[PDB]
Design a protein around this motif. Structure first.
Motif, PDB file in Angstrom:
ATOM      1  N   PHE D  48       0.803  -1.213   0.000  1.00 28.60           N
ATOM      2  CA  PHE D  48       0.000   0.000   0.000  1.00 28.60           C
ATOM      3  C   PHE D  48       0.838   1.265   0.000  1.00 28.60           C
ATOM      4  O   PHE D  48       0.486   2.233  -0.678  1.00 28.60           O
ATOM      5  N   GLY D  49       1.942   1.276   0.730  1.00 28.30           N
ATOM      6  CA  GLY D  49       2.802   2.429   0.755  1.00 28.30           C
ATOM      7  C   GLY D  49       3.545   2.535   2.062  1.00 28.30           C
ATOM      8  O   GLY D  49       3.201   1.886   3.055  1.00 28.30           O
ATOM      9  N   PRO D  50       4.592   3.350   2.081  1.00 27.80           N
ATOM     10  CA  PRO D  50       5.380   3.499   3.302  1.00 27.80           C
ATOM     11  C   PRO D  50       4.595   4.236   4.364  1.00 27.80           C
ATOM     12  O   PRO D  50       3.690   5.024   4.074  1.00 27.80           O
ATOM     13  N   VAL D  51       4.947   3.967   5.612  1.00 29.23           N
ATOM     14  CA  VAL D  51       4.282   4.633   6.720  1.00 29.23           C
ATOM     15  C   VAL D  51       4.945   5.965   7.031  1.00 29.23           C
ATOM     16  O   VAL D  51       4.269   6.940   7.362  1.00 29.23           O
ATOM     17  N   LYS D  52       6.267   6.024   6.918  1.00 34.45           N
ATOM     18  CA  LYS D  52       6.991   7.247   7.215  1.00 34.45           C
ATOM     19  C   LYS D  52       6.673   8.324   6.180  1.00 34.45           C
ATOM     20  O   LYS D  52       6.272   8.043   5.049  1.00 34.45           O
ATOM     21  N   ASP D  53       6.861   9.577   6.594  1.00 27.31           N
ATOM     22  CA  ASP D  53       6.452  10.705   5.766  1.00 27.31           C
ATOM     23  C   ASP D  53       7.134  10.666   4.403  1.00 27.31           C
ATOM     24  O   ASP D  53       6.472  10.685   3.360  1.00 27.31           O
ATOM     25  N   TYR D  54       8.462  10.574   4.399  1.00 30.79           N
ATOM     26  CA  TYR D  54       9.230  10.495   3.164  1.00 30.79           C
ATOM     27  C   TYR D  54      10.376   9.501   3.288  1.00 30.79           C
ATOM     28  O   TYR D  54      11.304   9.532   2.469  1.00 30.79           O
ATOM     29  N   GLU D  55      10.322   8.612   4.271  1.00 32.21           N
ATOM     30  CA  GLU D  55      11.382   7.652   4.517  1.00 32.21           C
ATOM     31  C   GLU D  55      10.863   6.242   4.282  1.00 32.21           C
ATOM     32  O   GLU D  55       9.673   5.965   4.456  1.00 32.21           O
ATOM     33  N   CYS D  56      11.762   5.352   3.880  1.00 30.13           N
ATOM     34  CA  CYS D  56      11.401   3.953   3.732  1.00 30.13           C
ATOM     35  C   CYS D  56      11.341   3.291   5.104  1.00 30.13           C
ATOM     36  O   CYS D  56      11.882   3.802   6.091  1.00 30.13           O
ATOM     37  N   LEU D  57      10.680   2.132   5.163  1.00 30.91           N
ATOM     38  CA  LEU D  57      10.601   1.405   6.427  1.00 30.91           C
ATOM     39  C   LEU D  57      11.975   0.917   6.872  1.00 30.91           C
ATOM     40  O   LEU D  57      12.301   0.966   8.063  1.00 30.91           O
ATOM     41  N   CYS D  58      12.799   0.452   5.928  1.00 34.13           N
ATOM     42  CA  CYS D  58      14.106  -0.095   6.278  1.00 34.13           C
ATOM     43  C   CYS D  58      15.081   0.991   6.706  1.00 34.13           C
ATOM     44  O   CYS D  58      16.134   0.675   7.269  1.00 34.13           O
ATOM     45  N   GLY D  59      14.766   2.256   6.439  1.00 34.78           N
ATOM     46  CA  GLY D  59      15.631   3.337   6.854  1.00 34.78           C
ATOM     47  C   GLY D  59      16.791   3.604   5.927  1.00 34.78           C
ATOM     48  O   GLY D  59      17.662   4.413   6.266  1.00 34.78           O
ATOM     49  N   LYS D  60      16.838   2.942   4.774  1.00 31.82           N
ATOM     50  CA  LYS D  60      17.946   3.151   3.855  1.00 31.82           C
ATOM     51  C   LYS D  60      17.945   4.567   3.305  1.00 31.82           C
ATOM     52  O   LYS D  60      19.009   5.104   2.978  1.00 31.82           O
ATOM     53  N   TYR D  61      16.775   5.186   3.185  1.00 36.79           N
ATOM     54  CA  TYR D  61      16.686   6.514   2.604  1.00 36.79           C
ATOM     55  C   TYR D  61      15.734   7.347   3.444  1.00 36.79           C
ATOM     56  O   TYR D  61      14.665   6.874   3.845  1.00 36.79           O
ATOM     57  N   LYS D  62      16.127   8.594   3.702  1.00 37.98           N
ATOM     58  CA  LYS D  62      15.337   9.505   4.519  1.00 37.98           C
ATOM     59  C   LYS D  62      15.316  10.903   3.915  1.00 37.98           C
ATOM     60  O   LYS D  62      15.251  11.896   4.647  1.00 37.98           O
ATOM     61  N   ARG D  63      15.346  10.999   2.588  1.00 39.41           N
ATOM     62  CA  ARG D  63      15.498  12.284   1.923  1.00 39.41           C
ATOM     63  C   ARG D  63      14.714  12.266   0.619  1.00 39.41           C
ATOM     64  O   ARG D  63      14.433  11.206   0.055  1.00 39.41           O
ATOM     65  N   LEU D  64      14.365  13.463   0.140  1.00 33.96           N
ATOM     66  CA  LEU D  64      13.777  13.599  -1.189  1.00 33.96           C
ATOM     67  C   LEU D  64      14.759  13.168  -2.267  1.00 33.96           C
ATOM     68  O   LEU D  64      14.354  12.906  -3.404  1.00 33.96           O
ATOM     69  N   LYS D  65      16.048  13.109  -1.916  1.00 31.69           N
ATOM     70  CA  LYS D  65      17.099  12.683  -2.834  1.00 31.69           C
ATOM     71  C   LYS D  65      16.869  11.280  -3.374  1.00 31.69           C
ATOM     72  O   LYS D  65      17.285  10.971  -4.495  1.00 31.69           O
ATOM     73  N   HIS D  66      16.213  10.416  -2.601  1.00 33.57           N
ATOM     74  CA  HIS D  66      15.921   9.060  -3.040  1.00 33.57           C
ATOM     75  C   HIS D  66      14.435   8.847  -3.308  1.00 33.57           C
ATOM     76  O   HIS D  66      13.962   7.708  -3.283  1.00 33.57           O
ATOM     77  N   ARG D  67      13.683   9.918  -3.541  1.00 32.99           N
ATOM     78  CA  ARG D  67      12.259   9.779  -3.814  1.00 32.99           C
ATOM     79  C   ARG D  67      12.019   9.008  -5.104  1.00 32.99           C
ATOM     80  O   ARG D  67      12.664   9.256  -6.124  1.00 32.99           O
ATOM     81  N   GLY D  68      11.082   8.065  -5.046  1.00 29.85           N
ATOM     82  CA  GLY D  68      10.710   7.273  -6.192  1.00 29.85           C
ATOM     83  C   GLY D  68      11.529   6.017  -6.383  1.00 29.85           C
ATOM     84  O   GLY D  68      11.185   5.194  -7.240  1.00 29.85           O
ATOM     85  N   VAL D  69      12.589   5.829  -5.599  1.00 36.15           N
ATOM     86  CA  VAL D  69      13.432   4.648  -5.721  1.00 36.15           C
ATOM     87  C   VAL D  69      12.854   3.517  -4.883  1.00 36.15           C
ATOM     88  O   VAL D  69      11.969   3.733  -4.048  1.00 36.15           O
ATOM     89  N   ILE D  70      13.333   2.300  -5.118  1.00 27.68           N
ATOM     90  CA  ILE D  70      12.852   1.108  -4.433  1.00 27.68           C
ATOM     91  C   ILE D  70      13.976   0.555  -3.569  1.00 27.68           C
ATOM     92  O   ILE D  70      15.078   0.291  -4.067  1.00 27.68           O
ATOM     93  N   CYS D  71      13.703   0.390  -2.279  1.00 31.52           N
ATOM     94  CA  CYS D  71      14.680  -0.208  -1.388  1.00 31.52           C
ATOM     95  C   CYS D  71      14.674  -1.724  -1.552  1.00 31.52           C
ATOM     96  O   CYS D  71      13.703  -2.317  -2.024  1.00 31.52           O
ATOM     97  N   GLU D  72      15.759  -2.361  -1.111  1.00 31.37           N
ATOM     98  CA  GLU D  72      15.844  -3.816  -1.159  1.00 31.37           C
ATOM     99  C   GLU D  72      16.116  -4.421   0.212  1.00 31.37           C
ATOM    100  O   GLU D  72      16.367  -5.627   0.309  1.00 31.37           O
ATOM    101  N   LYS D  73      16.063  -3.617   1.272  1.00 28.15           N
ATOM    102  CA  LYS D  73      16.197  -4.123   2.632  1.00 28.15           C
ATOM    103  C   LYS D  73      14.843  -4.526   3.201  1.00 28.15           C
ATOM    104  O   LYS D  73      14.771  -5.425   4.045  1.00 28.15           O
ATOM    105  N   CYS D  74      13.773  -3.829   2.802  1.00 23.30           N
ATOM    106  CA  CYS D  74      12.415  -4.163   3.226  1.00 23.30           C
ATOM    107  C   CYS D  74      11.451  -4.320   2.056  1.00 23.30           C
ATOM    108  O   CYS D  74      10.448  -5.031   2.198  1.00 23.30           O
ATOM    109  N   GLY D  75      11.721  -3.693   0.914  1.00 24.17           N
ATOM    110  CA  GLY D  75      10.893  -3.758  -0.270  1.00 24.17           C
ATOM    111  C   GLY D  75       9.919  -2.616  -0.473  1.00 24.17           C
ATOM    112  O   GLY D  75       9.270  -2.565  -1.526  1.00 24.17           O
TER     113      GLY D  75
END
Ligand SMILES: [Mg+2]
Ligand SMILES: [Zn+2]
Lengths: 101, 17, 153, 288, 99
Positions: D48-75
DNA sequence: GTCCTATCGATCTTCGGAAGAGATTCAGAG
DNA sequence: CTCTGAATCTCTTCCCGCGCGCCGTAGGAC
């Protein structure tokens, strides 16, 4: 429950005993009982290198790297304690290995 | 709404069409 | 001939369902109407109904529904619950008689102080029937070794 | 989105799959101690989508710099968390299931289409009696519901020259067999055959339904649900209350019941449970 | 009691309701009928999109009001979208149309 | 004690609502 | 033998704001 044993290896002593103090205290606050720390023998390497680029030979500088070791044993880990540990940051530069049982 | 001032806007939209 | 009959039962109370039937058969002394009530189980595929070796008498029809935690049998009609089959019994008696930790894989510990935590495999302790998974302690991914039965795949 | 009209129609199962971003499988949402959302649950982060405002669940990215990318630590995909209230999922039922609305409206739409009484269609749907389809060289009519004793008769009087299914499956086959337009032409000429005004009126209703289904792009099997979309979780929050507890959510619990029953049905069909048990499980799933 | 801006509900972003909560008055259906009895359409559009429901709009309105512009961009009431999802969760494909 | 699975899967859900309309079953007879 | 009557069933409806107060999964197994 099995005690959890932490082996700390560091090159600086004051920094190792700072991280140790942190850890023992942390455990004690969360109401776990912790054995140690016990100072485990320091392994001091040595190296003798000729300083002269050419052939003086009897111009050795002796350099020793000393590795400090501490063992902290935490009897019966209550999961809340585990979370105490697991959010705190232990001084970096410091090597921590954990054994369980 | 298609009434009052909203009707004026809709009527203008339909007449300008 | 006591054809097997399938009975609905309180999930989680299915053992008490079989036992509560076992007592009631002898107390109502209908031992000549019941074989055994099977609850197959592996190291219980369907936490649910029970199989009862039984005959079909109105006294037995009300007897099973007089055991606690028993709605009744599963059949075509409530007037006559139906047996299972010829081969179905044999198949059930057949079965009643008859995952490698990858590097880089993310698992949770199954038991111990680290149980149910986000860990990542760091190395392979294969031949010792053990495991070694990175954990987040002290702000580091410290090397922590565990038993094999601590996997959560 | 700018719009000028609103259109309502039946949703084909592949359309539902088009709506969905994932298939919810595990009927769990969050841990009862930690507040992280369990993956492949009713609150899966990657579905459905991440819970954090603009951060992934796995914490790999916490910035607009990685907006739209897909993490591979949590998916989980990192974007604006608001999308979490718009993405839907879908549950692929292990067996067909009739849509309750279309079964028990003021008339019975499924019944009207099949010209089969509501009591009998309900009796079929809840696995009480067989109904013969493709009866072939048998004295068994187009639908001709038949009881278990009657089925036990047909099992030996005839071999496999008849087919008698149970529940929504039989109705789905009937829906899948509906030659709608030819049927409507026949009924609209049969209308002139009689003056039964106690039947001409309901015949006009039936033909009107047939014309409406013919004209619309709707297809009969769409009255039987096969994939059930799940509501976006942010519309059904599991809000916490005073203390380490989350307020009960009705829809979440209804979905939990449905998912558990369906997973049990899949487990049994994998393990080849006896016909009686699977029939009972299918009835329970339909009622859930 | 009076409310300018404060807490907003979660499922639908309409403002909270009550005194112990910093909530606003409910604009009931009868009030909507009365507004429709006059020709007031801009009033209704504001009252049911900017003041209450359109999350992006009510901030752009806040900025304009501070800037002294007094112009609204209504957009679309979020609650309606929620409704759409609630119907789309059934076997119904209801959608907006261009023409 | 914590952490798990599941729904009276040996009951009896409340009789102290009117009503208004369709829908669904049943008569007297063509 | 089933066609138009009624006759009995189910489903749906019931002004609107305000303001407190409280209450809010359960049993048994490791
Ligand atoms: Mg040495
Ligand atoms: Zn992530």
């Amino acid at each position: 429950n099995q005690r959890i044993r932490i082996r700390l290896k560091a090159f600086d002593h004051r920094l190792i005993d700072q991280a140790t103090a942190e850890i023992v205290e942390t455990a004690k606050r969360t109401g776990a009982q912790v054995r140690g720390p016990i100072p485990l023998p320091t392994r001091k390497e040595r190296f003798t290198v000729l300083i002269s680029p050419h052939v003086n030979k009897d111009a050795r500088d002796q350099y020793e790297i000393r590795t400090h070791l501490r063992l902290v044993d935490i009897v019966e880990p209550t999961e809340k304690t585990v979370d105490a540990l697991m959010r705190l940051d232990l001084a970096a530069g410091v090597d921590v290995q954990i054994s369980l049982g | 709404i298609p009434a009052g001032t909203g009707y004026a806007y809709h009527q203008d939209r339909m007449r300008r069409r | 001939k006591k054809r097997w009959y399938v009975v609905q039962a309180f999930s989680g109370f299915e053992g008490r369902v079989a036992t509560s039937l076992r007592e009631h058969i002898k107390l109502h002394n209908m031992e000549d109407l019941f074989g055994e009530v099977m609850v197959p189980t592996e190291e219980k595929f369907f936490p649910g109904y029970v199989l009862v070796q039984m005959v079909m008498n109105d006294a037995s029809w009300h007897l099973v529904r007089s055991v606690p935690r028993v709605m009744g049998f599963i059949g075509g009609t409530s007037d006559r619950p139906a047996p299972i089959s010829d081969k179905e019994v044999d198949a059930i008696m057949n079965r009643l008689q008859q995952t490698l930790f990858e590097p880089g894989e993310m698992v949770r510990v199954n038991d111990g102080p680290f149980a149910d935590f986000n860990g990542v495999v760091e190395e392979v302790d294969y031949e010792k029937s053990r495991l070694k998974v990175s954990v987040s302690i002290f702000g580091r991914a410290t090397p922590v070794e565990l038993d094999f039965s601590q996997v959560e795949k | 989105e700018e719009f000028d009209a609103i259109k309502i129609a039946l949703a084909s199962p592949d359309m539902i799959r088009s709506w969905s971003f994932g298939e919810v499988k595990k009927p769990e949402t969050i841990n009862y101690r930690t507040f992280k959302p369990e993956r492949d649950g009713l609150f899966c982060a990657r579905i459905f989508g991440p819970v954090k405002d603009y951060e992934c669940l796995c914490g790999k990215y916490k910035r607009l710099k990685h907006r739209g990318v897909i993490c591979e630590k949590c998916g989980v995909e990192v974007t604006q968390t608001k999308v979490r209230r718009e993405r839907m999922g879908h549950i692929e039922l292990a067996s067909p299931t009739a849509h309750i609305w279309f079964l028990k409206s003021l008339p019975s739409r499924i019944g009207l289409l099949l010209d089969m009484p509501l009591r009998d269609i309900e009796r079929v749907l809840y696995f009480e009696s067989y109904v013969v389809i493709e009866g072939g060289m048998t004295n068994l009519e187009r639908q001709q519901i038949l009881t278990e004793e009657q089925y036990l008769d047909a099992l030996e009087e005839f071999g496999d020259e008849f087919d008698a299914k149970m529940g929504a499956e039989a109705i789905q086959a009937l829906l899948k067999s509906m030659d709608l337009e030819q049927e409507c032409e026949q009924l609209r000429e049969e209308l002139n055959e009689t003056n039964s005004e106690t039947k001409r009126k309901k015949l006009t209703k039936r033909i009107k339904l047939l014309e409406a289904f013919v004209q619309s792009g709707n297809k009969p099997e769409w009255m039987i649900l096969t994939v059930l979309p799940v509501l976006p979780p942010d519309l059904r929050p599991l809000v916490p209350l005073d203390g380490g507890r989350f307020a009960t959510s009705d829809l979440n619990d209804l979905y939990r019941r449905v998912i558990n029953r369906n997973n049990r049905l899949k487990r049994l069909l994998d393990l080849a449970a006896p016909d009686i048990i699977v029939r009972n499980e299918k009835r329970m799933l339909q009622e859930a | 009691h009076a409310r300018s801006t404060g807490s907003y509900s979660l499922v639908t972003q309409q403002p909270l309701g009550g005194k112990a909560q910093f909530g606003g008055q409910r604009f009931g259906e009868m009030e909507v009928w009365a507004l429709e009895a006059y020709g007031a359409a801009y009033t209704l559009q504001e009252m049911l999109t900017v003041k209450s429901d359109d999350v992006n709009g009510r901030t752009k309105m806040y900025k304009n009001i501070v800037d002294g512009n007094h112009q609204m961009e209504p957009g679309m009431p979020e609650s309606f979208n929620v409704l759409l999802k609630e119907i789309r969760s059934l076997g119904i494909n209801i959608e907006l149309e261009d023409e």
